Amino acid sequence: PPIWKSYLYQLQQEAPRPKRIICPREVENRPKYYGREFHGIISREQADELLGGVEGAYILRESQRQPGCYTLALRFGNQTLNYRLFHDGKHFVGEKRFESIHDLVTDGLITLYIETKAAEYISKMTTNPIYEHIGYATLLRYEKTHNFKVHTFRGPHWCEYCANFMWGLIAQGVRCSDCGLNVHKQCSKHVPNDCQPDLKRIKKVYCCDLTTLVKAHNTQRPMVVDICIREIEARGLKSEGLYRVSGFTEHIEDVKMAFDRDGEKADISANVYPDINIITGALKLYFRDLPIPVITYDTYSKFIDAAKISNADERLEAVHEVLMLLPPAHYETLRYLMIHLKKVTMNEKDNFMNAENLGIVFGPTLMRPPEDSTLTTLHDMRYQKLIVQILIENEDVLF
Ligand SMILES: [Zn+2]
Ligand SMILES: [Zn+2]
16 A cells, blocks of 8 residues: 555546536626525525435525625535535635635535545544654654644645645645645644644655645656666666666665755756665655656556456557547656666567566556555456556557
8 A cells, every 4th residue: 555545536527517607597686795696585494495316416595584695505416415604815614715706605515425435434534644764754864832723735745644635625734834844733632733834845756646746846747756767777778677676665765855855856866876786776666756656546447457458459459548548747757757768678688578567567556556455456456467568568659
């Protein structure tokens, strides 16, 4: 399993979206400022009709009794929910939310779908934590309080504590202002003081969503994946057992830790780290540390239902089909690491590594099962290695 659990993330994607601004016959009712989703004053019995079934549809209304009292009513399958609705210079239901409508319903619905399914899980996140050994709070080189602050993450982010997904559209969790940490609102309570405010000058590259890293650094492909390969190709392209042999684990850590600031885009060479299996390791590491797999989860399933054709003519075309359903960042990263990788195949006369060969060492890391249905999951691990091998083989045909 990966340090970064995917249950929540997995959920949010399943979560229902504001299935209806469900506007009125343009009645333009007078008492009302912001909205066209406002059906003025009406009865619960009449409102419900407007929504009806459509889990996710929402509407706004005023109290037939007490004036100036508006309330939001969105459907959540099981039934219909009325929430109230204020405006502190910006729309907002309960929670110290404060948004800009829809964002509300959206996030609200998310908070609903998740909390409903496995709220128990969301509670035990505190138990058996993981913050202890995650990074730089273990490596790198007394008491102090955390000046935590609510923060809206732009890009999937995970709690450096319960190492779980921070769901929500803008809710998110908190990011200490001094040490740069980022965790769940709750978890903030359970996270020990410690904190090293100069450990913020870091800016981790290893471990944040692929697409996000790329977009933020302006580069299509993770600058690590780039540099790494550069070297591996410069040096040991003909070293034996490339990517199969492991390097000093504790030396790979040193590399990663190097990409994370300390050099970031300006890391390091051939000497300093002579056993290239380190680098080959670090690179493997990088793919291992992604919160979302290069092959994604939403694709994992479909990528398997391809390595099952047996008729190599359709396999390839199948693979391509789904290879296309991949998010830009992922795709591009895969593409690249399926050359300055598959060029390794053009060398098994010196490194003993080939498609089928590498397809092993990578399958397991460039792919991951959604989980929570573990049974045939083991009867699939095979195909993973296949897929990879296949991609390395027919490299210049797919991209
Ligand atoms: Zn957490
Ligand atoms: Zn701090």
